[model samples]
Target chain A: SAHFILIHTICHGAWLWYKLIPLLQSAGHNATAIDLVASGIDPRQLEQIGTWEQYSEPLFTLIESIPEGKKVILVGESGGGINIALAAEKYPEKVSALVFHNALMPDIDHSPAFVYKKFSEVFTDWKDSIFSNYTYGNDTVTAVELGDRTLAENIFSNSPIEDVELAKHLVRKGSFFEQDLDTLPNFTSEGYGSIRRVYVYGEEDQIFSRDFQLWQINNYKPDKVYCVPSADHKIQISKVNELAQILQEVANSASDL
Target chain B: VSAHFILIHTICHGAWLWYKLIPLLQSAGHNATAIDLVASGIDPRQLEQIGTWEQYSEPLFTLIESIPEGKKVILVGESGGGINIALAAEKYPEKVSALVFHNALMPDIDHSPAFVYKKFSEVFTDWKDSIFSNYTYGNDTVTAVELGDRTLAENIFSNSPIEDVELAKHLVRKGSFFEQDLDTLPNFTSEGYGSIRRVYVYGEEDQIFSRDFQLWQINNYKPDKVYCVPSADHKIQISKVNELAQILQEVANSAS
Candidate 1:
């Protein structure tokens, strides 16, 4: 059985998974990184996009295209976690286990305004700044780059200094589709027969605070959750080694059960 | 084959002319009634029955409460008319047979009225604030003006002819702020109001309510019934009355 399918976050494509991919592959498991449609600096395809469905379609197609009878572990990082949850709900049978690494959960059948209200308390200061920047497409490259630095610093503080710098360099700008945060019904249901879920959050993640992470964990009710002691939002890169071990444990338990 | 039909009107519209649809429905062995709200249409004593948002539900509540024995009526609301019908369905889940919304405003679960205005008002300058003011109809009538710009009119009235547009220009009234009053209802979710039969009959060329917005409203409401009249306006009966009647009959037949 393949070990994991690593999905990257906003502002960074599958390239961010470069550091973690090798480790997960070596641990007697296969790890594949996915590049979401129009995610990493593809301007030509941006105009054709309409709803969140367009963004989620490619990922769902990729997951379904995987070989049959292969139980694969699924990992979504940051905003990519929203797509991963949607895909998991869509093709639960193909997915053996699930993981979220410092990502926001999919909206639960409400307006984006309502969803943001719940997240505002913990991320108050960064809320308006981050939202306006992200939604309005304010500062293209620099905003993403600075956001990358802020995310890595807060999410990966537990990792060695070298890993953090590598992640910052790999960060890419993402397109801003405001409707992407709207509620989805499929993710709320139990698909793929209650697959094991794990959420890994960086204790100091500025993008999503610890309190917000706790609320998400409780709302989503993942099977097991792990937190990096001093990690920031980019925990996959910051705490790559530990995440590899946790991924292995989840896969082992999933296969056994 | 005498089917029961409920025809709901839009903002600044009364149940008077919906009777035009009743005759066509009766011609096809179907029975229809045009429901009147507390402060709508040509109801003579509109001024005497002044009340808050809670009172708007009176007509619908009474209709639902007095549903004849063993009879399930197909509920159709046009524009703002659908708001109360949606509420009635939510309140009396058992009485409604089917729901039909014609170019109406669906309830917003998350958005505030101010937010909706801020986002939508850019298209129609002065129309939003002016129509909702006490000056529009002495604090009683909701004005519904057709703020038809090129893009909006093109999107809404794509299928209608020049003559229809002229008539709509005449019949259309500016909507009052009272209609905006009910946008805050809480049970607007798809599943919140139990799974009753629902049909959305949208005008492809309606200038007042854009097709995309209508489609979004239908998506949010998650209606089981859907009909698209290619060249109709906000006055669905006038634009595509026969087709509207046909769709209503289908809803009636499908209802359990």
Candidate 2:
């Protein structure tokens, strides 16, 4: 049976992955969505989880505990891609491939310095509506609410109104790691890049603009690329079937790698 | 719960709540699907699209209409979802096996859930704060009614684990336009909808729909069966999924 471990974006949790898990299961694969501590359902507040190591611990331990020869297929979206990359770097032997669904792709750097700099630049001018309703501490950021007005033209624009609400419903507080992924762990091409890399491009993404997706893609070309003309940052909910198909295909082809 | 189940999301909620529940039902050989009502969930129906009770709940009625002629499915409603579930059950009494209200409101033949909720509010001051006090309704405007951010965590999951509260807060959405003309109220027991076998399940400590009002409404609606949880609150679905899942199966097994 195929094992697919899903990681969520900033402020998102394992709950959002529920939409994609069923689709993968029907395709005969076992899928699990891991929520970072203080991120989704773990219940810890972001203030208590100050450092990057504590933030990424849940996923690192999850990947570390995969039994021998399991060769899991790792899938991450948005900030989750950063986690997948770190795990890929640490456990290349256990991972068959790394899939980034409109996720942040950090190039090989000593730490994620280049990635964090690029990451912070994206949200430098985000709408107050995006973060105003959040329950922030001194430094923690939580969830997005592309209200009915901005939603029509923003992330998951083409998605059904119901799914947009669904996406908004699962929003939680994100770690400061978005501004700090580069400060932690030293990334290496031999470890992280050794596994197959696939980037699913969202051509119409508003959160991670198509231009930036291309910038990241161009910077570090992946093994394969899939494009959805109308997808957005919330592809896991917007282009659900499409995401499931890509995950199944990647998991199926891991044997070849 | 192996039979076809139409999952109705609560207020401000969407079909997404059913995301985790769907697979569990299917794993046990059941089928399920969730729907989005107008001005609720992510349903993009413009404010202009929401003109009346009929306009708001057209999706549910249409969905019930679309279900096959004689194949009955269990209708499960959460929170405000009870209204639509009742409407669908009444509209196609023959097509529904049973009605389950999961910590939801039971409507009057002529009164709206909002009206009933407001009445409950005037009766209980704390429940007043639980509702967005800024709520305003008009022919052309419907303010989004959201749970109070301050007390939402405690009220909805009072006795459940903190993880459950986290999931509740995590999954809770700022609800859709909830104002509708009372004249358009679907005669809940107005006839066809009420004849269906209905079940009511609630938590003893629900903050919004207080146990007093729940029983009052349950007494008014007179569902064939009523189940209560001693420790859970309004968001019973999250805290009691293990039991809800099995309860659904047994309900289906007993009725079908």
Candidate 3:
């Protein structure tokens, strides 16, 4: 009954939503996932992405191209929460609600880097995750490449082996724009804050700890918070049925702004 | 009876192409592994980094070499991936049970490494808006081909599901590495690739390689058997999974 724009997490692509798209459609809802500019197989390299705007252009283009008078529920996973935040800020009227699924939900209270830096502080078990720095203008830009061991342990602990293997074959290096975001302005009340925001997380998520997820909710209270018991960071891959049900409920309850 | 089936995808594709087929093969009591050729899929290497055949097909070689001495794997190659398994079989023929050419270019020992590739280029000239970029190896420069989105939907995935077609649109890489001018590249030896059993499977209605073209390649150097699936296109692995799986099961059983 609702339109869902499934945004992928860092280094992920629209291909990540291959499982959830059909599930949503089978339940009579429209869902479309978008690959970021340089992520997935979008024909753009990581070096081509220098700014946050450049990174999120593909999503912006997709949203802008959607039909008039229609609104989309932006469901972002993990780092994709920031993408939803950007979209909500850009076109609050076009977005029905911002749904953060085990994502970093930003608030109007602080800079965009606030929630991400907090999560990084609590989650020190990066394992083999590699961090490299490159020059962007006068400042240094950092890119994060999630390691196989870290991906298996932290992200895909409760997911199927086949799905994990698929992720291994598709995942690319991601940039958080931590330094760039540190300099950007905070979310405005009239823009991102004008829309409804919902938070969803898994009880067994290793990357985004339960405590951190709760901290995010307490830091910036959303319209609703739904937690899937025994689900990992990637609930879409691990607990498709439960996530789909939750998404259905979220769509049914979507009211006009 | 179970057999290890290693799947190799065409240019601009990765191991992800076998996402739907892996579970099917696994459920049928077979071990399926898909390898990403260098610069293709999510192999982390760029096109510029892979200029030689060794570098381009390193993943398949590495996987085949890692298999135990007594164990033999059934190598299934699609499109340009056919040459990858052929090279691997050439290097370690003792470890290969049979080669399955699924709408792939099957090279014979009589011609150079780029023989079938050259033939494919000679026949398929209408790229249909597909982009081409030039890359140089040794003294010659050849074009690296990238599939256009419209071309993929209209041509390659003509018979595949919309979801899969959409997935391919999102995942297809910029350019492929098989267009290298490889006249200097060596041919397969009789003691190696020529000694292994080969099977050919094609979609009866494949648009990329027509029925005549696929049959032409098959006739150029005949395989042990040829099986055709009706209404399937270039991506027979995607469009005709059940049929391909059935054929693969039979091929595995026969190879054993």
Best by TM-score: 3
Q: On residues A193-247, what C-alpha lDDT tens digit does candidate 2 reach at each position?
A: 7888999977677767777888888888889999976777778767878888777
lDDT of 1 at B97: 76
| Tens-digit lDDT string for candidate 1 (A129-220) | 24323322332221333354454445444554434443443344454354444433434456632667777888767668777889877765
lDDT of 3 by residue, B1-256 (tens): 7999999998888899887788789999999988778878766667866667777887788888789868999999998888888988999999999999999989999999888888888888778878988777566575677788778877788788776776776678766544454566788889999999999999977878878789888889999999999989889888988899999999999987
DockQ for every model comes to: 0.01, 0.06, 0.36
Location of the lowest summed lDDT over 10 successive residues in candidate 1 chain B: B163-172
Model 3: per-residue Cα lDDT over A148-218, one tens digit each: 78878899888876667678778888888777778778999999999888899998998898889999999
Clashing pairs for predicted structure model 3, backbone only: none
**DockQ comparison, 1 vs 2, better candidate:** 2
Candidate 2 segments whose C-alpha is farther than 4 A from its true place: A122-125, A130-152, B1-256
Per-residue lDDT over B1-256 for candidate 2, one digit per residue giving the tens place of the 0 to 100 score: 3598888877656665664566567678988777767655445443434545566678888887887758888888988787678667767788888888898766655555456566555665563344543333454455555565446656665665453343344445456535456334544664666577778888877876777788887876577888887666776666666667777777878776
The runs of at least 3 residues in candidate 1 whose Cα sits more than 4 Å from the true structure, single-residue gaps closed, are A41-50, A107-117, A124-170, B1-256
Question: What's the CA error at residue A90 for candidate 3, in Å?
Answer: 5.1
- TM-score per candidate, in order? 0.43, 0.53, 0.77
Top candidate on lDDT is 3
